[PDB]
Amino acid sequence: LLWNGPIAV
Amino acid sequence: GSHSMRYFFTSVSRPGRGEPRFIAVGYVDDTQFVRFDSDAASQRMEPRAPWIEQEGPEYWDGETRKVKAHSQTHRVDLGTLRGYYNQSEAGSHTVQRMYGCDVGSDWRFLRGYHQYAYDGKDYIALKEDLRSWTAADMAAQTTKHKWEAAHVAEQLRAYLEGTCVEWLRRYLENGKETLQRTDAPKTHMTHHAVSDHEATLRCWALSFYPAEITLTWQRDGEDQTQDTELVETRPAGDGTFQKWAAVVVPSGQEQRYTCHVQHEGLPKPLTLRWEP
Amino acid sequence: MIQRTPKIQVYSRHPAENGKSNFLNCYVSGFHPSDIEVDLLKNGERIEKVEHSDLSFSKDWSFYLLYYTEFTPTEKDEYACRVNHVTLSQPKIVKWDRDM
């Protein structure tokens, strides 16, 4: 199951 | 044995040629179970292993939503990193991302990771404790401060230590007749004379899983990477792996040479010796 | 910009036997950037029905792919792998050795 929380650099 | 769930993401820019390529792949141990490719027809997260195909429309809809959010983050990242390093519009650049968790024999959490690279080198990484970041240069420091200000480590850690492990256990349980087995390597040795003073011994490992293996040649129980030849572990294409290692020896001296095989599926390391 | 040149292996899925159906494999690994052309050749001419794995990468961030096609080995037929990449002055051709 993927992580829901990736944030731009 | 210990297990892992790992996701891999690749984003590549296309100067003058529109939207960037984006590929996403998920693995339990060395078994691929989902993929997404922006160049493919579905524009959905797709199954790649039988046991995952039994999850409902809920799982697929949400995984599609979240994989599109990764894609969009990566879309913005390529613009941002072009700015940070002031690179021209002319070149293609590449972002890569890996995250995952490991569990031990008991399926309890063991370690987690999140690594990010630009143009083939480390940019920023989560450290061991899952509480802080390692940034490679002054541009990646900008990112680190933004990600501290947004408490990204905290929620990433919540996923790696909770969600990641919880879904790994479920996938292990559902796909157990194909994730929870180790396939012992099938071994054989070949002998091929090259002249009247020299022969090649070649040690084979075939049909093994997982991919982690060690093949070492010894001469009277002493390590031997003088005049060894070792290939990289390679996929068969049916879920198993292959590898060989070769040594060239004086004729009449075959029996001084032993090939040692270490693999998880073996209860103990094998020794192989050329018997004519 | 790092640039890494591919390693190539050409091999079969099962031990090779004439007239027995099998899979011909071209494993390209160790490369960067990700853009790479891979063809399987029979007697010099490209094979159309070739499949490839999804792009993944190792701990050093270098890429790997497997290209594979269903084939039946015979006496007279030669099989190779042609690979092009930004690190190669011209495409590398690697012959299939049946032992290997």
Domain boundaries, chain B: 1-181, 182-270
Q: What is the resolution of this structure in A?
A: 2.2
CB atoms under 10 Å from CB of B142, counted, come to: 15
- Cα separation, C81 vs C97, whole angstroms: 11
- This entry's atomic model was obtained through X-ray
Helix (H) or strand (E) holding C41: strand C37-42
Does residue B92 belong to the interface with chain C, where contact is any CB pair within 8 Å? yes
CATH 2.160.10.10 fits B182-270, yes or no: no
Residues of B in contact with A3 (CB under 8 A): 7, 66, 99, 156, 159, 163-164
Q: Give the relative orientation of helices B57-85 and B138-149 as an angle to the nearest 10 degrees.
A: 140
3-state secondary structure string, chain B? CCEEEEEEEEEECCCCCCCCEEEEEEEECCEEEEEEECCCCCCCCEECCHHHHHCCHHHHHHHHHHHHHHHHHHHHHHHHHHHHHCCCCCCCCEEEEEEEEEECCCCCEEEEEEEEEECCEEEEEECCCCCCEEECCHHHHHHHHHHHHCCHHHHHHHHHHHHHHHHHHHHHHHCHHHHCCCECCEEEEEEEECCCCEEEEEEEEEEEECCCCEEEEEECCCECCCCEEECCCEECCCCCEEEEEEEEEECCCHHHEEEEEECCCCCCCEEEECCC
Smallest CA–CA separation between A4 and chain B, in Å?
Answer: 6
Question: B120 and C32: CB-CB below 8 Å?
Answer: yes
Question: How many Å lie between the alpha carbon of B70 and the closest alpha carbon of chain A?
Answer: 7
Chain B residues near residue C61 by CB distance under 8 angstroms: 96, 117, 120-121
Q: B1-181 domain in CATH 3.30.500.10? A: yes
Contact B70 A6 (CB under 8 A): yes
Nearest to C7 among B35, B190, B232 (CB): B232
Number of inter-chain CB pairs under 8 A, A vs B = 46
- Quick one: which of B13, B5, B167, B151 has its CA closest to B77? B13
Domains of chain C, earliest start first: 1-100 (2.60.40.10)
Contacts of B among chains (3+ CB pairs under 8 A): A, C
Query: Which residue type is seen at B142?
Result: T
Contacts of residue B146, Cβ cutoff 8 Å, sequence gap at least 6: A7, A9
Q: In 10 A of CB B81, how many CB atoms?
A: 21
Q: C56 vs B235: CB contact, 8 Å cut-off?
A: no
Count of residues making up chain B:
276
Residue whose structure tokens are 């559902």: B174
Chains C and A touch (3+ CB pairs under 8 A): no
| Structural tokens at position B175 | 């796909």
Residues 6+ positions from B34 with CB-CB distance below 8 Å: B24, B25, B26, B45, B46, B47, B48, B52, B63
Q: Is B94 on the interface with C (CB under 8 A)?
A: yes
Scanning every residue of chain A, which has its alpha carbon at the shortest distance from the alpha carbon of B24?
A2
3-state class (DSSP) for residue C42: strand
